[PDB]
């Protein structure tokens with residue numbers, strides 16, 4: 001997989017962000033994770049966490065997997081990096097997402113993310129508290 005440039009347009013919630021990619025605005029949905037909706041427990045904390053990560057980043061990059069690059073809603077599906085750190089993994093390591101929506105052929109980082117979720121669960125963090 002490879003990283004490609006993008007710039008932030010707007011934070012949305014824990015697992016979606018509006019980015020400019022190849023010069024076009026698109027909403028990205030983070031692969032392999034599910035954050036609570038803003039209206040649910042830990043929703044506001046997830047949204048805040050992702051917002052801080054992406055707003056503070058000097059460099060945002062998008063990494064598509066081997067499969068589908070847009071979902072049925074027209075959202076890009078990617079792993080998102082902020083100054084080299086993967087947002088998807090950071091959410092899992094903090095207990096602010098669950099690994100989910102693991103579809104065959106778009107699951108390159110599944111085991112990296114499950115390892116982070118295991119460590120969050122051992123620490124009883126946030127969702128696992």
Ligand SMILES: Cc1cn([C@H]2C[C@H](OP(=O)(O)O)[C@@H](COP(=O)(O)O)O2)c(=O)[nH]c1=O
Nearest residue numbers: 015029030031032033034071072077101103
């Ligand atoms: C993460 C992801 C979601 N989706 C679709 C599945 C779910 O469809 P349904 O809307 O029919 O439940 C929806 C969940 O995204 P959200 O968690 O953002 O609601 O997005 C994909 O198709 N591929 C993906 O990789």
Ligand SMILES: [Ca+2]
Nearest residue numbers: 034035036037
């Ligand atoms: Ca969600």
